[PDB]
Structures are given as structure tokens and as C-alpha cells.
TrEMBL record, chains A, B:
Belongs to the parvoviridae capsid protein family. GO terms for molecular function: structural molecule activity. It is found in: Virion. It comes from the Viruses. The chain holds residues 219 to 738 of 738 of the full protein. Keywords: Capsid protein, T=1 icosahedral capsid protein, Virion. GO terms for cellular component: T=1 icosahedral viral capsid. This is Capsid protein VP1. Beta-D-galactose binds at residue 55. Residues 1-492 form the Coat protein VP1/VP2 Parvovirus domain.
From TrEMBL, chain C:
Signal peptide: none annotated. This is Capsid protein VP1. It comes from Adeno-associated virus. It is found in: Virion. Belongs to the parvoviridae capsid protein family. It comes from the Viruses.
Length: 520, 520, 208, 104
């Protein structure tokens, strides 16, 4: 039986590779403080201050914290991630299991300048999952506070808050307020533990691979087509330019002119930025020249956007302004940090099926020609979905988000998250946790006012999350060797994906998921 | 049921001698501190400093500690060791059993200058065995930190660390990093206990005995051989030296010339050092004149080396420089301590089957003789294995290591540890233990940085290890009395293998395992 | 696979050994050099001096050749300076030989003369073809357990010292099997042979 | 039943990766000429010529040919070899099967 002298659970970290399943499991140590002195608070920012109209919000910050495991490096070691991306075409999550155990609640008190900390054995914490998704779902925005990548780290649990409809800083009539104490929650003392199990809905495998064929090269290089195209509108070789309609079969000589069954994926253009500083314009175009969308009078930057190739062949240095996911190196500031600190992801692999982010989708005619009027062709900067169009989703990264919640709406088009991930209508429920408030001594004469004086308190414990993953094994007749993800062979001051002299775990580079090839 | 008010186990120290088995069992009290402030750290030493190229390393120090029982005096009292070595030819370990129990976790805090210590009832510790040998196996290097020989001592648990491939101080690409929190481990509070059982693989008995015959004396002293040898190449007694081939049967008169079926064990020469100071050269030859091996550009001293006789007949004072195991007396420094403090072991008994460490293996011819050219014979300093060669392993000591792990490799030759012991492909798993980190109060506003502030904490408890040993009983028709290991009869200021006036347990001398004789 | 640990680094870097070694034979700091025996525990500071349970694999030396042409001697030593064995009056080149590390750390350019398997590139002649056509294999990975092919196995004493006679240590060029010795076999290649037939004989040692 | 108008076998090249086994299979087309005009012949080289003492030999060359599959790249594509060496610590052969068919 449970008690103060027996542990509620054991430490488990593994990856079990069996057949087409891999079961990854993680355990971390967390510390949950008291947020907002146990208060709900209205929070808002209006345009009255230096804030612009785009940055206005209205919402509430709660006392509650929440667990976020939504990043891959929570569930995978760099070596486990290497087994995955080298040997497999696809993977998808199946089920997860989640546990809290070994909970300590501790009171801390100040006397003059000295601090002291003592166990409080009778205190509780409150934990519930929102199984029914009745709360604003705050996961999937790529917020900080996930379990650390490295298992020996102890992490602080992030505070829960949410945003609601606003006009300026003020709230409208449809604005909702949620009291989290109004759900049923389990209360745990130091001998109690918490568990639940969740099963993922059927979701398509993330495709981890690149195409070994571009979309326009699917043809046989040897053979002509029986179809014809219009090769020349004018008389050739004549002393007069008299117009004449001449047709030709497209063939190995002109492939660009052949008939084709499919079209590249949709395009929404990004502004191109060069890593070489001299090539860029001299100005600040970051916000002004940015690609934005306009929703209810507020312009929101489009980030990262629809999945589009970062750059074309033999341009390494150019990247779309908002187009790529950008990760920071260990110990990087939050504000105006130099380029050397960020790690730019790149989509190389989707150049085959997807247009380049920084270039036009194509060119269409602007006019009806006449013998008098010359033909005019305009560029297509943004192109929605057309029939016969194929595309790839953005690639997941070891540092990136696993899933997002598909908004509940009448309709959606290809509901896959633009940060990359698995779109889920019923994602893993978000787990909320709070220290139960313990009052400081009340007065001896009754007063109606609520008690504003509490014992300063925090809790720690252990958390285990276990996800079963389904694998799609690579089966390929390719003769020559694949590209693999490999560590650098040459010597270095310190090992990649390992602690340094000071004990700081760092991740050198973002690791994409597609090294394998398939036929398009 | 377990709890804070009931003990998790009992104290057991015994040696049960039953039939051909002896079961030894020990219990000690340990104290496990917090190592590296709960951090992994890169550690290295390069040649840039005063360090030479031989001393360079690259590796990691962990927060974890580990239990090491690998020395014999952990499992045997001097009296139990006497029953063993006097009455038995051989012994080998069969199975072991291991327990942690009666675990206290204590927090300590500083206020001004005063220290105070208090039980923390809800804290845990983490314990796992590496059953699958997936970690660098750090036992068997004869490191300190084993359970004390004397049961009333309380010992500190040593910190775990490991080394990895390096070039200079820098790491190469094959360098591995291991996170120990990434294994499954059991978490124990103060009412919990830990246990596991391990069974030794079949290993040959350590041979505890000396041969009563030298390898070259196996002949009958009474009878001649029917074989012949070449006695004389020259005419005897003649006024001319005309060469003539003369043969003789070897017999009691010349035994050195007889034909023999076997050869002494292999030889790798050591430099000879005299305990008498005047006889040694005047210089420091300790490192320069040392016998070394050369591996990947680094010269490593050969210690103790292949098993070889310490000295020949009627030389007590000479010993091979690196050839013998060297134990210190109680309370001896680690650096440049005088000869009186160390206890030199000696192999007397293997003079029969093994060559002397400080002398040549033999002599072979350097040339093809002619009537013109005189025969020339060179010395053999180092000799590998030849067919028809027999040898003894080095002797185990009460202070010495029990086993080593046989490296996992394509091939090996007579895989027995050179420090002496039992070579094991699957040695006893190494047990890792750590205090679970407990955070000090986090801030009330969320921060992504890992928590660097912890409660100063340590744990204590009890550890029992029980090994069943299999004995090979001595069965011998020798008429006259054996040599036995006996304590000194004469009076002394204090008893050997007992505490002194101040309570310090000391071991006067190393006790070898071979007092019995067998026929070679 | 390769080993992630060298054979001599198996120790714990944190902890000292309870064993002692002979650190110094002479009096330190004194105006006289009077000899005195001083012992020390080996530790993280000197790892090369620690006691060890195992030895590197056996050594049969090869002559070292540099890919940089200027560094090599000017002569034809290919056959003359080669490492050979002598069987029934015929000297046979030792090729490739016992498995030994091709080169030590931070020397790429050196290779043992006969020590490595040598494959040709597509369309290469059979006679006196230039270096660019052959593909030299290398054993990097066995540096941990195996000695370098082009260097000595170790050093042993050549004499019994005296107050009169200085200690002398000779090199070991070729070393047979010793107890407590471990080694790796040579690596197979995609272009290389799968198996061989073990000769039928009274005895053999590690028949690989 | 066999005959001049029916093939004796089929072309098979695969690598089947199942569990802890991999089964590799290869098929090639060979041409076997007539050696030594159907004769056995003594062959030798002595030191009498420019040959040295090390290069001397005595032996026989037969009319017969022989099949040698003993190299790895016979049984593995570079991609199959990559799956092997990246994902595995060790491998050993278990059994083999061998066929001649479609003989002209």
C-alpha cells in the first residue's frame, strides 16, 4: 500500500524496437511553483501603449501549470532518432501512457534573511486531464516548457493561460472565462500517483524520405510522345515573318514542352533573404517586406507558411524570410540575437514536388492577343489548390513539434500543421496541475473577505510519458547506397549531442527526418 | 508491509562452510553523497599542460556512484581466508546475491556557520544494475572504494566515470556519450529495499597450491634415457682438435641435457631492482628503464605483466620493477612514499613452471656455423607462446581483485586477468546508485532554463553481498607436513589483523593463496 | 563494429588505484643523487603507470611507407625492405599479415608496405600501375586493441642493472601470443573474400 | 518435364531481410570455354630462367573450370551492404544453395 515511506513509481527511460513498433519512454523530474498567488487574472494589451493594433490581446492567466511533451526530443535520443530516420520511410504515433509519481510538496519560509525548506506531508496537488477538450487547447503553438531533451535535467512546469476574443484591449460579449477548479480533478498527497492512457486516432504516416525523381521528369528519356504541342507560330527561314501554325512532338530534346499529368503544390510567395550580408538590400524590410495575412483587421506574419522548397539548385545562401523553422543554439538570447546563434532549417528534399518558396509559381497570360496586340504573360505569386496538384508536407525535426490540434470548424483543406506534425482532431489531452492552496492562520474574528494569505509552497515529482510508435519499413530496390545521417568523423573539442565541460547539454544542428529516397 | 518505522533488512555477516561449498556474506554501512551537483561533465587532459602524450584522456564524470565488492577481503575474514588457503587446492565463485536496505536520505542545510541535518522522508534514490553490460565496465581496474575489509567501517561510495576514444584532449567521431538516467532504474524511499541475484559462468578453479616438482626435473633420477644427444663436437684427448661427432645418453649425471616434453611459460622481461640501495644503479630509471608496451602512439607501462617468478633461488632482495603487485600499509601516502610503507608481493611458487621475471627466457642461435664462422647464440628476452608450453597464473591475494571482465573481442589468448583473478565474459553486473535531485524553490515566473538550485542532500544505508564459493578439496598422499599459513607465535605490541589503540584496522602483510603442494 | 574505448583506457578517470608502482629510484631534491626507492599510487594524473589486466594483440612489424613521395627514401626497398617469412628455403612476402592498425593518430599518409589489402579501381593494369589506380584499405578501428603495424610492440630490458651498469631496454619488433592478450581480426570488405579453408593440420592458433 | 523448349530455371536476385536473417541470392550468366584442348598439362617454373628461387612451382593445369562466388559483392548490392554494416554488430553465413540451369 502507498505511504510516505514507499515510492509511487520507478524511473523508466527506454526505446524498445520490436518489429514495426518502437516504444519510447521518458522520465523527468519537475518542479511546480505557485502561480499568480493562487489567483486568476485578466491580462490584456491594448494599442494605447507602444503596442500596435496587431499585438492586442485579451485573456486570462491561471494559477495552473501544464505538462507539455509535444516535442520529439522529449521522446527520442539522438541515437534513437538516427535509427528511425535512417531505416524507415514513415512513422506515426499509436498510443501513449502518462504517469505522475514520487510527489513531494514542500513549504518554504523566510526568517530575516535566511531561507528554509521543509516537507509538508499533508498537502496535496490537483491534477486533471481535459479528456473532453472543453478548454482552450494551448499546446501546439510551439511554446517553451517541454520536458528537456536530456534526461538528467530538472524542468519548471509552465503556467497555463489562454486568450479570448478582444476588441483592442477590451473584451467583447462572446469572450469566455474558464475556471479550471470547475472541472473534476484528482488530488494527490505524497504517497499518491496519477496515470492515464490515451490512444491516437488513425493518422497518415509522416513521410520520411525524399523523392528520387522530380515531378516534371517522370517521363521516359528514350521515347517520344505521340502528343503534339505548338512549337512555332511564325514562318521559319522566310524573308517574311508571315504567321503559320507549326506543331511538334515533344521528346528527349525538349522535355519542358511535354504533356504532363500533374502540377506542383500550391505557392504563397516569401521574400528572399541572403546569408551573405552584402547581397541583401540596405533597409529594415523584416516586417515591412514580410509576407503577411490579414484577419479581422490585424496583419499576422505568415510563419512558417505552406511547405515550400527553401531554395533552388546551387543556391545555399538564400532562405525565405519567414519560410523556414528557426531553432536557436544552446544559450541564445530571446531578442535580436545574431545569425550565428540561430540554426536555420532547410527543405532541400521537396524541390521535386514543391515550388521554391522565394520564386513565382508560374506564368499565365494577361491578355487576349490580336494581330495588333502582343501577348502578355503575368507572374503567379500566390496559387491555391488546382486539380492534379501534388505536394509534400513540411518535415518534422528532432527539436520540433509532434502534433497539433486541428481546429474544430465546418471545413478545412488538407489539415496538416504548417510547423509540421500530425494534425489531430482529438490530440493528447492537456494535463493541468496545481498546488492546492494552504491558508496561513486566519484571524480569530470572522470576516467575509476571501483569504489572501497563504503558505509559500511548491511541489516536485517525477513524470513518465510512454508513446508507442508504428513504423513503415523501407523496402527499396535501389542499387547504390542511400544518404544516411552520420556524425562527423573528424576530431572535435567536445562530442555532439553531449554535455560540455560545464555540464550543459547542447544540440549542434537540427536533424531533419528525410534521408531515404522513394520514386515519385 | 514496509514503512518508515520498520527496518527493510537485517545485518548478516557469516561464512558457512558446508561440504565443498563455502558461503561468505558481508554487510556494510555506506554513505552516498551528491556528485557533480547532479551534472554530467566532460573531463579531459591534454598534452598542452605539463601532461605528456601518454597521460591524455577524454571522458565523462557522472553524478552516479557505484558499489564495488571486487576485492577478496570484502568477503573473507583473515581467519576465513586461512581455512581456505590451508585446506584447499582450488576455489571458484558460483553465485552471488546483493541487497540494499535500511535507506536513510538526509538533507543538510547551512545557516550562518551552523550545520544541521534532518531526515527527508519523501526523497528517493535510484538504483539499477547493468545486467546487459551496455555501459563501460569500470570494475576490474583495481580502483579504491571497495567495501572496507573490516565490517565496522562505514565507507563512501565512489563516483562513476568513464573514458572514451580521444586524440589528445579532443574527442574523435567514435567517442560515445552515455546518459545513465536513460536506463530503467528502481527508485527507493526509506522503506524500500533492493535485491538481485547473479550466477557466475563456469570458470576454472583458481589453483591455490605450489608444485612440488620443477618442470625440468620430472625425470626419474635412477634411470638413463634411451635417447641420445650431441655431447661433443671435437676430438677429445687428441693432440689435434679435429672435429668429430660424439653422442651420449643423458642420465642422472647430466639432467640438463635430457630430452623433455614441455617448456616453461612465456617470458616478457622486466628490469631487476634490488631492495638493497647500494646495489641499484644511481639514476632514475623507474620510467626510462621500465618495460612498456606501445599502443596507438602511447607507451603504457606493463604492470604487473605476465605471470613470472619474482626471483630465483637465494635471491630475496631482487624484484622486477613493474612485475609484482604492490600493496600499501595502513595509512600510506599516494605519492613518492618510502619503501617501508609498501608491501611487495612475491611469486615464489611459480619458479617451477615459469621463468624468472628479471632474466632471459633462453638462448637461441644467431648464425649458421661454418668451419670458418664460430657459432653465436643470442638471448631471448621476450617469448610468445610455443607448443608444449605450460605456465601458472598469478596468485590471488586477500587484498587483491576477485575478477575482471574479459574484453569483448574477436580473439584472445588464455583470457585470465594479469592482476590475477577470474576472467569473466559476463562478470557481476555493476550497480549504479544516485540521489534523486530535489529542486530548491523555483521562481514564481516561468523560465526555460534548467533548475540549477537543489537541496543539499545525501543518503546512507546498508549493503549485503553474499557469494557462494565452490571448493576443490585437497587430496594428497604426501607423507611429510605441508607448509601452512600461520600467525606469528611471538609476543607483539598489537595483534595482527586487528584494531590498534586508536581503533584503526590494519593488515600487516599480503597473504597469498598457495601454501599447498601438488605434483607437477 | 569499432570499440569506443581503447584497451589501456578501461580505467575510471575519477578514482585512484589502491595498487602501487615504482615512481622514482633516486632521491629527489637532494644535493646528492643517492638512490632511494619511492612508490606511488597511479591515478588520473598518470594513467600510463596504472596496473592493467590485458595486453594488446600480437605484433609482427611492417615497413612504413608514406603516400607523400618526398618523405620516402630514394631507393627501391619494396622487396628488399619487405617483411618476409622463410619457409623451406623460399622467402615469401607477408601479405597482408596479422591484423594490425594501419597508422596511429593524425597520420593519414603512412601505411604498412604489405600490411593493408589493396584493391584496384575499375580498368587498372596488372603491372606497375600508379598509386592513383589502387584503393588502399585502412584499419582505423583496431588502434584500440591492436598495435600499429609500422611500430614496435613495446620495449623490454636487455640487461641486469648494477650500480656500475646502466639499465638498457631493447625494442620488441615481433611478439607472439602472451597470456592476457586480446586482439581484433581484420575487417571484411564488400570487395573482399568471404571465407577461407582452414588447412588440415595437427594444430593452429586462432584459425582466422 | 525437361526438354529443349522449356527453361530449366528462373532468374532470381533478391535480398530478403526477415528478423535476424537476411537471405541474399544472385544469378549470373556464364560462358565456359574449352581449356587445354581437353588436356591435363604439367606446368612448372624453375630458377633456370630469370625466375628466382622463391617463384619456383610445379603443378598441373586441367581442362576443368570452376565457379567462385567467394567475394562479398557477389552476394550484396552496395545498398544491401549498407543496411548490413549500419544496423548490425555481426553476421555469419548459415547455409547456401546453388544452381545451374538454362544450359546452352
Amino acid at each position: 500500500a502507498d505511504g510516505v515511506g514507499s515510492s509511487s513509481g520507478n524511473w523508466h527511460c527506454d526505446s524498445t524496437w520490436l518489429g514495426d513498433r518502437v516504444i519510447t519512454t521518458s522520465t523527468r523530474t519537475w518542479a511546480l511553483p505557485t502561480y499568480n498567488n493562487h489567483l486568476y487574472k485578466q491580462i490584456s494589451n491594448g494599442t494605447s501603449g507602444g503596442s500596435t493594433n496587431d499585438n492586442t490581446y485579451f485573456g486570462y492567466s491561471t494559477p495552473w501549470g501544464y505538462f507539455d511533451f509535444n516535442r520529439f526530443h522529449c521522446h527520442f535520443s539522438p541515437r534513437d532518432w538516427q535509427r528511425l530516420i535512417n531505416n524507415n520511410w514513415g512513422f506515426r504515433p499509436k498510443r501513449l501512457n502518462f504517469k505522475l509519481f514520487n510527489i513531494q510538496v514542500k513549504e518554504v519560509t523566510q526568517n530575516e534573511g535566511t531561507k528554509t525548506i521543509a516537507n509538508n506531508l499533508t498537502s496535496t496537488i490537483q491534477v486533471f486531464t481535459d479528456s473532453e477538450y472543453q478548454l482552450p487547447y494551448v499546446l501546439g503553438s510551439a511554446h517553451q516548457g517541454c520536458l528537456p531533451p536530456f534526461p538528467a535535467d530538472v524542468f519548471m512546469i509552465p503556467q497555463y493561460g489562454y486568450l479570448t476574443l478582444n476588441n483592442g484591449s477590451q473584451a467583447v460579449g462572446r469572450s469566455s472565462f474558464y475556471c479550471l477548479e470547475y472541472f473534476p480533478s484528482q488530488m494527490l498527497r505524497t504517497g499518491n500517483n496519477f496515470e492515464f492512457s490515451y490512444q491516437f486516432e488513425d493518422v497518415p504516416f509522416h513521410s520520411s524520405y525524399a523523392h528520387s525523381q522530380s515531378l516534371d521528369r517522370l517521363m521516359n528519356p528514350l521515347i517520344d510522345q505521340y502528343l503534339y504541342y505548338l512549337s512555332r507560330t511564325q514562318s521559319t527561314g522566310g524573308t517574311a515573318g508571315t504567321q503559320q501554325l507549326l506543331f511538334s512532338q515533344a521528346g528527349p530534346n525538349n522535355m519542358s514542352a511535354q504533356a504532363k499529368n500533374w502540377l506542383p503544390g500550391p505557392c504563397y510567395r516569401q521574400q528572399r533573404v541572403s546569408t551573405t550580408l552584402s547581397q541583401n538590400n540596405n533597409s529594415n524590410f523584416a516586417w515591412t517586406g514580410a509576407t503577411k495575412y490579414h484577419l479581422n483587421g490585424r496583419d499576422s506574419l505568415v510563419n512558417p507558411g505552406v511547405a515550400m522548397a527553401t531554395h533552388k539548385d546551387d543556391e545555399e545562401r538564400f532562405f525565405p524570410s519567414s519560410g523556414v523553422l528557426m531553432f536557436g543554439k544552446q544559450g541564445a538570447g530571446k531578442d535580436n540575437v545574431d545569425y550565428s546563434s540561430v540554426m536555420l532549417t532547410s527543405e532541400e528534399e521537396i524541390k521535386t514536388t514543391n515550388p521554391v518558396a522565394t520564386e513565382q509559381y508560374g506564368v499565365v497570360a494577361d491578355n487576349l492577343q490580336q494581330q495588333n496586340a502582343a501577348p502578355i504573360v503575368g507572374a503567379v505569386n500566390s496559387q491555391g489548390a488546382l486539380p492534379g496538384m501534388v505536394w509534400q508536407n513540411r518535415d518534422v525535426y528532432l527539436q520540433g513539434p509532434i502534433w497539433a490540434k486541428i481546429p474544430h470548424t465546418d471545413g478545412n483543406f488538407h489539415p496538416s500543421p504548417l510547423m509540421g506534425g500530425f494534425g489531430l482532431k482529438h490530440p493528447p489531452p492537456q494535463i493541468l496541475i496545481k498546488n492546492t492552496p494552504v491558508p496561513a492562520d486566519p484571524p480569530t474574528t470572522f470576516s467575509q473577505a476571501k483569504l489572501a494569505s497563504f503558505i509559500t509552497q511548491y511541489s516536485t515529482g517525477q513524470v513518465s510519458v510512454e508513446i508507442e510508435w508504428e513504423l513503415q519499413k523501407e523496402n527499396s530496390k535501389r542499387w547504390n547506397p542511400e544518404i544516411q545521417y552520420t556524425s562527423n568523423y573528424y576530431k572535435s573539442t567536445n562530442v555532439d549531442f553531449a554535455v560540455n565541460t560545464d555540464g550543459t547539454y547542447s544540440e549542434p544542428r537540427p536533424i531533419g527526418t528525410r534521408y531515404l529516397t522513394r520514386n515519385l
